[PDB]
Amino acid sequence: SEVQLVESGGGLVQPGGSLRLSSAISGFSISSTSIDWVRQAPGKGLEWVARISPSSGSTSYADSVKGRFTISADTSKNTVYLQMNSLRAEDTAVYYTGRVAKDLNSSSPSFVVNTYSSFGFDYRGQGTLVTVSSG
């Protein structure tokens, strides 16, 4: 199959609200790689959010979301998910799934996003817009 990463589940929520994001991935197996959620807000650098290795179930999180966000995977559906609880204005961004290039996979996701931003992902979806506002 052609490689696709289709992120969905974004929308408008008030502070304290929750969303569950999905990324349906085709053309490579999520069982053979890590997958990162990253987010891009206006006037800010690309921000790493969370990493999952579906084969092992190993997960890591940015300090900015740890305890509120949960990254998970369904290997059979080749899909990754981001459960986002108690959303805040500062969580407003486009949320993307990316696969870091195999040749950079020994670097921390924080290092990859800080050093290479978008250039470190050999594939990345067009993402889903998440807007947290009361006014």
């Binding site: 052609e2 490689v3 696709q4 990463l5 290039a101 195999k102 040749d103 950079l104 050093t115 290479y116 931003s117 978008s118 250039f119 470190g120 992902f121 050999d122 594939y123 990345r124 067009q126």
Partner: protein, 179 residues
């Protein structure tokens, strides 16, 4: 078809040099691929031999589309290179990591406004010692050349005491800066 790629700021071409002693230097040089997206860069890098696995005397060159990886190009003739010289042990430890870091400095425009002075990069796989170089367009442009050198050395993670040199192509064919 459906997948939307990420355009690079510049369009690029990868060149391969095969040492054949019977042929001219120019005849041994071949353009092997053009690309202008993040995805197509990684697809190419994943579909060719690592520099460390090349036959002795072979090169890779990554240059902006329309710049040939030779001194004679209009964009190179007044220019020069930041040169990294590797010892024999460094082929296994450092060559591929340094080359990929160089490629990412190029396609990622990592020298900000000064990236406009970058023409390309060359890796020479050699028995006597491997070489990696970033080629820039004007050896007189000390502001751009000094900035590219400093940031390149930072990105490679070279110890301060490993001094790297900038040579003009005019001098090579017959150090203007160090960091």
């Amino acid at each position: 078809e459906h997948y939307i790629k990420h355009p690079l700021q510049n369009r690029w071409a990868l060149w391969f040099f095969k040492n054949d002693k019977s042929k001219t230097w120019q005849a041994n040089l071949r353009l092997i691929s053009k690309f202008d997206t993040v995805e197509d860069f990684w697809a190419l890098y994943n579909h060719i031999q690592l520099s460390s696995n090349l036959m002795p005397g072979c090169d890779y060159s990554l240059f902006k589309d329309g710049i040939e990886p030779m001194w004679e190009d209009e964009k190179n003739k007044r220019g020069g290179r930041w040169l990294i010289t590797l010892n024999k042990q460094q082929r296994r430890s450092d060559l591929d990591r340094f080359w990929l870091e160089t490629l990412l400095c190029l396609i990622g425009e990592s020298f900000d406004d000064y990236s406009d002075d970058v023409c390309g990069a060359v890796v020479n796989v050699r028995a006597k010692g491997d070489k990696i170089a970033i080629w820039t367009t004007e050896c007189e442009n000390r502001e751009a050349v000094t900035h590219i050198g400093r940031v390149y050395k930072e990105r490679l993670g070279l110890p301060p005491k490993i001094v790297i040199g900038y040579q003009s192509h005019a001098d090579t064919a017959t150090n203007r800066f160090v960091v």
